[PDB]
């Protein structure tokens, strides 16, 4: 519950562009097992921010 | 011999001009206080015995 992944944009072999913690636009309240957030019929979410 | 003379010249002009110009320009601005931006690629290593 309250899923906030910490992810990383990487170029090339290991050239990391950025490391971003998921913000409140990117929060997932429930992630039950064998499921997706968001659901498979819906479109995936957008991450475009660096600020808190 | 004594020669007098007197002339009077009356003139008129029309004119066209077709001026075609192609201009190329290039500019490089800089601020000496903010020349460069940095980005580090780093890892964390635990050689200890307890986790942190």
Curated annotation (Swiss-Prot), chain A:
> What's the subunit arrangement here?
Homooligomer; homooligomerizes to form homoheptamers (PA-63(7)) or homooctamers (PA-63(8)). PA-63(7) or PA-63(8) form ring-shaped oligomers that are in a pre-pore conformation, which do not penetrate the host membrane. PA-63(8) displays an enhanced stability, suggesting that this form circulates in the blood to reach and exert toxicity even in distant tissues. Interacts with lethal factor (LF) and edema factor (EF); can bind LF and EF simultaneously and interaction takes place following homooligomerization on the host cell membrane.
Q: Outline what the protein does.
A: Mature form that oligomerizes and forms a pore to translocate the enzymatic toxin components edema factor (EF) and lethal factor (LF) into the host cytosol. Following attachment to host cell receptors and cleavage by FURIN, homooligomerizes to form ring-shaped oligomers that are in a pre-pore conformation, and associates with EF and LF. Toxin-leaded complexes are then endocytosed in a clathrin-dependent process, followed by a conformational change of oligomerized PA-63 from the pre-pore to pore state, which is triggered by the low pH in the endosome.
Q: What is known of its domains?
A: To pass through this hydrophobic restriction, substrate proteins LF and EF need to be unfolded prior to translocation. The alpha-clamp consists in an amphipathic cleft between two adjacent PA protomers, which assists the unfolding of substrate proteins LF and EF. The alpha-clamp binds non-specifically to alpha-helices of substrate proteins LF and EF.
Q: What is the effect of changing residue 48 to C?
A: Loss of capability to undergo conformational changes that lead to pore formation and translocation
Name this polypeptide is given: Protective antigen PA-63
Give the consequence of mutating residue 51 to A/K. Loss of capability to undergo conformational changes that lead to pore formation and translocation
Instruction: Please give, as recorded in its UniProt entry, the membrane topology of this protein.
Output: Multi-pass membrane protein
Source organism's superkingdom? Bacteria
Q: Where in the cell is it found?
A: Host cell membrane; Host endosome membrane
